Enzyme design. Structure first.
Site, PDB file in Angstrom:
ATOM      1  CB  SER A  53      -0.866   0.055   1.275  1.00  0.00           C
ATOM      2  OG  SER A  53      -1.596   1.271   1.411  1.00  0.00           O
ATOM      3  CE1 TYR A  79      -4.497  -2.182   4.309  1.00  0.00           C
ATOM      4  CE2 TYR A  79      -3.715   0.006   3.774  1.00  0.00           C
ATOM      5  CZ  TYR A  79      -4.129  -1.248   3.369  1.00  0.00           C
ATOM      6  OH  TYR A  79      -4.170  -1.579   2.014  1.00  0.00           O
TER       7      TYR A  79
HETATM    8  N1  LIG Z   1      -8.843  -1.142  -3.844  1.00  0.00           N
HETATM    9  C1  LIG Z   1      -7.834  -0.314  -3.542  1.00  0.00           C
HETATM   10  O1  LIG Z   1      -7.882   0.881  -3.876  1.00  0.00           O
HETATM   11  C2  LIG Z   1      -6.637  -0.785  -2.773  1.00  0.00           C
HETATM   12  C3  LIG Z   1      -5.775   0.194  -2.328  1.00  0.00           C
HETATM   13  C4  LIG Z   1      -4.666  -0.160  -1.606  1.00  0.00           C
HETATM   14  C5  LIG Z   1      -4.410  -1.479  -1.292  1.00  0.00           C
HETATM   15  N2  LIG Z   1      -5.251  -2.432  -1.711  1.00  0.00           N
HETATM   16  C6  LIG Z   1      -4.908  -3.812  -1.344  1.00  0.00           C
HETATM   17  O2  LIG Z   1      -5.236  -4.692  -2.407  1.00  0.00           O
HETATM   18  C7  LIG Z   1      -5.820  -5.896  -1.884  1.00  0.00           C
HETATM   19  C8  LIG Z   1      -7.215  -6.036  -2.461  1.00  0.00           C
HETATM   20  O3  LIG Z   1      -8.082  -4.968  -2.083  1.00  0.00           O
HETATM   21  P1  LIG Z   1      -9.607  -4.835  -2.553  1.00  0.00           P
HETATM   22  O4  LIG Z   1      -9.842  -3.367  -2.830  1.00  0.00           O
HETATM   23  O5  LIG Z   1      -9.982  -5.881  -3.588  1.00  0.00           O
HETATM   24  O6  LIG Z   1     -10.296  -5.194  -1.143  1.00  0.00           O
HETATM   25  P2  LIG Z   1     -11.575  -6.130  -0.875  1.00  0.00           P
HETATM   26  O7  LIG Z   1     -11.911  -6.004   0.573  1.00  0.00           O
HETATM   27  O8  LIG Z   1     -12.682  -5.916  -1.898  1.00  0.00           O
HETATM   28  O9  LIG Z   1     -10.957  -7.592  -1.200  1.00  0.00           O
HETATM   29  C9  LIG Z   1     -10.262  -8.311  -0.203  1.00  0.00           C
HETATM   30  C10 LIG Z   1     -10.890  -9.673  -0.020  1.00  0.00           C
HETATM   31  O10 LIG Z   1     -10.098 -10.329   0.959  1.00  0.00           O
HETATM   32  C11 LIG Z   1     -10.929 -11.134   1.761  1.00  0.00           C
HETATM   33  N3  LIG Z   1     -10.306 -11.403   3.070  1.00  0.00           N
HETATM   34  C12 LIG Z   1     -10.027 -10.475   3.998  1.00  0.00           C
HETATM   35  N4  LIG Z   1      -9.482 -11.048   5.088  1.00  0.00           N
HETATM   36  C13 LIG Z   1      -9.427 -12.383   4.863  1.00  0.00           C
HETATM   37  C14 LIG Z   1      -8.961 -13.554   5.617  1.00  0.00           C
HETATM   38  N5  LIG Z   1      -8.462 -13.426   6.860  1.00  0.00           N
HETATM   39  N6  LIG Z   1      -9.081 -14.735   5.018  1.00  0.00           N
HETATM   40  C15 LIG Z   1      -9.583 -14.872   3.763  1.00  0.00           C
HETATM   41  N7  LIG Z   1     -10.025 -13.847   3.008  1.00  0.00           N
HETATM   42  C16 LIG Z   1      -9.964 -12.596   3.522  1.00  0.00           C
HETATM   43  C17 LIG Z   1     -12.218 -10.309   1.887  1.00  0.00           C
HETATM   44  O11 LIG Z   1     -13.391 -11.070   2.227  1.00  0.00           O
HETATM   45  C18 LIG Z   1     -12.315  -9.605   0.536  1.00  0.00           C
HETATM   46  O12 LIG Z   1     -13.258 -10.228  -0.352  1.00  0.00           O
HETATM   47  C19 LIG Z   1      -5.772  -5.757  -0.351  1.00  0.00           C
HETATM   48  O13 LIG Z   1      -4.572  -6.377   0.120  1.00  0.00           O
HETATM   49  C20 LIG Z   1      -5.672  -4.279  -0.137  1.00  0.00           C
HETATM   50  O14 LIG Z   1      -4.944  -4.008   1.070  1.00  0.00           O
HETATM   51  C21 LIG Z   1      -6.358  -2.121  -2.435  1.00  0.00           C
END
Ligand SMILES: NC(=O)c1ccc[n+]([C@@H]2O[C@H](COP(=O)([O-])OP(=O)(O)OC[C@H]3O[C@@H](n4cnc5c(N)ncnc54)[C@H](O)[C@@H]3O)[C@@H](O)[C@H]2O)c1
Ligand SMILES: NC(=O)c1ccc[n+]([C@@H]2O[C@H](COP(=O)([O-])OP(=O)(O)OC[C@H]3O[C@@H](n4cnc5c(N)ncnc54)[C@H](O)[C@@H]3O)[C@@H](O)[C@H]2O)c1
Ligand SMILES: [Cl-]
Lengths: 304, 321
Positions: free
Chosen positions: A125, A150
């Site tokens: 991130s 985070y």
């Molecule tokens: N979308 C963004 O803008 C963004 C920005 C920065 C970082 N990220 C990172 O990218 C990744 C994906 O993000 P996203 O936006 O798709 O988020 P999201 O919450 O839509 O997807 C994450 C998925 O992980 C699953 N999950 C969470 N904890 C879990 C566990 N302990 N066991 C099994 N499954 C679990 C959730 O149910 C969820 O469906 C994450 O690591 C997030 O930190 C995303």
């Protein structure tokens, strides 16, 4: 065919990555715990669109040690794209971050170690930049001063990745994400909140551009570099097969442009992303107008 | 009186810190899970020497979220010295990642005035520039243990920043002395010697190990516990270091600048024990502690000659040699 593990496959980015890998002919195993951080039915809707013969889904929690060990031992994955995490920077519910982002990540690493996964790509991130003020944020910069738990957990993932690349030779690539938006997006982020509240009472990258970059990176396997030293290298390189890259859209766009784009479609801080664009020879080319239109079209279609 | 929590209180360093704080007139609660990483009878022997009216012990695991919350809630600590850690990859995660969060949460919700915690010189990882300084990058750990310690520093930074909890991390090198741990330092060599096991000797015994006598560590830690980090609006990342912040957050190296080499300790042990150690010659470092000197106005005073004699006096008596 190659066998990929996509964690967080029912989530926003995981869904799109799994979908793309499936469309490219690969075997994909998806895992997700379907937690209720946001509308679980949205996650289910995404999961329903991944029904393909070469897709297998397992509801599994990252923190489930035995479950995770068994998954890795049984499936013998070729590569892993790790996206499951407790996201959102914005103090309440610290235990969720520890569970998912610390313990869960170590279980991913242990799986990769035991089964010699050929490449682990994982989500970091931009929040790791923390108190840093020198712009644009670059992977050559120190990232020692996080301002959210985070962020601290994401930097800890990079540190753990380094350790495992060095000790076991597992190639790792961490991707520092900024803001991602598009169809099947997150309810808790701005674009969605606005659209919803608007109907009722920044570095942005369109999801397709993110997917294209991640799928190219998955094929670029970091190699060891016996000549690398801390003193002449970076916090994003190593002698080990370890890399970290910023991923995003280096374009001058303030929050108001997207707010204006919404009203247009509804009818009512910089970052150095050059090292990734080079490595994979791709740069995001989706316009804010087309992106928000695709989102609203999806939003209206899905919710009406 | 002030009330301190000492975690890892049945362990080597924690025992000594708890004993000193008790002797200064403070109230101390010690916790430890009494794990069997090394002889539990030794841990209980340390715990027996903490029998003071102002001491209370609770067998508790750092990873027990409800148990940890209950401890902090019922006791309302003024300060915390966190030493408990695994030093099985899952043990590191449990004790050193989740356990550390339980400590931070306890400090946050009960407004602990100062948290001092153990880090490690292992965070220096692949670094080669000597001496190791807290100004140096610590992004390339080579062990899970090291990665978890750097993670503790990162987590401490976020809690200091968000909640104003003052935190001081101490990057320990090697500590030695009475009531030491059997798997390290002089105790490791003594055990090997008395069991007729060979000691591995690198670089002709001229490796400069950073060994500090336990009493010198105790004096420094007890002084540090009284120096509470303050916020600083003038700090920036660009003019600062990984060990300072605008938040009330600090990290210091703690160790011994003496130029004594590994063979000096072995020779001294041989003399004290009246025997010659078996050695395996393996075919073919320094740290900066100026910041802690400028801070607490104390440097290590114990020579190797005396430290080794102190250790052997303890060992012979405890093991009835
Ligand atoms: N979308 C963004 O803008 C963004 C920005 C920065 C970082 N990220 C990172 O990218 C990744 C994906 O993000 P996203 O936006 O798709 O988020 P999201 O919450 O839509 O997807 C994450 C998925 O992980 C699953 N999950 C969470 N904890 C879990 C566990 N302990 N066991 C099994 N499954 C679990 C959730 O149910 C969820 O469906 C994450 O690591 C997030 O930190 C995303
Ligand atoms: N001795 C050294 O030379 C040295 C060097 C570098 C760092 N350190 C650090 O100093 C601290 C103290 O170490 P020590 O040398 O006294 O080691 P030690 O093993 O003698 O003491 C640590 C104590 O922590 C307890 N403990 C471990 N996991 C626990 C858990 N989950 N819950 C509750 N208690 C738990 C153990 O039972 C033990 O008695 C550690 O954090 C260590 O990483 C020590
Ligand atoms: Cl010792």
């Amino acid at each position: 065919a190659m066998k990929f593990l996509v964690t967080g496959a029912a989530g926003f980015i995981g869904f799109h990555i799994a979908q793309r890998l499936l469309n490219e002919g690969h075997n994909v195993v998806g895992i997700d715990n379907m937690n209720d951080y946001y509308d679980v039915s949205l996650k289910q809707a995404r999961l329903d669109r991944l029904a393909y013969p070469a897709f297998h889904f397992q509801q599994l929690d990252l923190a489930d040690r035995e479950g995770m060990a068994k998954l890795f031992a049984t499936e013998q994955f070729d590569r892993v794209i790790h996206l499951a995490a407790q996201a959102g920077v914005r103090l309440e519910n610290p235990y969720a971050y520890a569970d998912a982002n610390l313990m869960g990540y170590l279980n991913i690493l242990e799986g990769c170690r035991h089964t010699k996964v050929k490449h682990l790509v994982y989500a970091s991130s931009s929040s790791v930049y923390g108190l840093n003020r020198k712009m644009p944020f670059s992977t050559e910069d120190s990232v020692d001063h996080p301002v959210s738990l985070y962020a601290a957990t994401k930097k800890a993932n990079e540190l753990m990745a380094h350790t495992y690349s060095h000790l076991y030779g597992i190639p790792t690539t961490g991707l520092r994400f900024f803001t991602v938006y598009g169809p099947w997006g997150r309810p808790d982020m701005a674009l969605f909140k606005f659209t919803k509240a608007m109907l009722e009472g920044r570095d942005f990258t369109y999801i397709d551009d993110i997917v294209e970059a991640v799928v190219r990176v998955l094929d670029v396997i970091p190699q060891a570099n016996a000549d690398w030293t801390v003193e002449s290298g970076s916090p994003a390189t190593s002698s080990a097969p370890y890399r970290v890259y910023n991923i995003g859209n280096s374009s001058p766009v303030e929050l108001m442009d997207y707010i204006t784009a919404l009203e247009e479609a509804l009818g009512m801080t910089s970052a150095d992303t050059q090292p990734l664009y080079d490595l994979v020879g791709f740069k995001p080319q989706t316009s804010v107008k087309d992106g928000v239109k695709n989102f609203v079209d999806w939003y209206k279609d899905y919710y009406q």
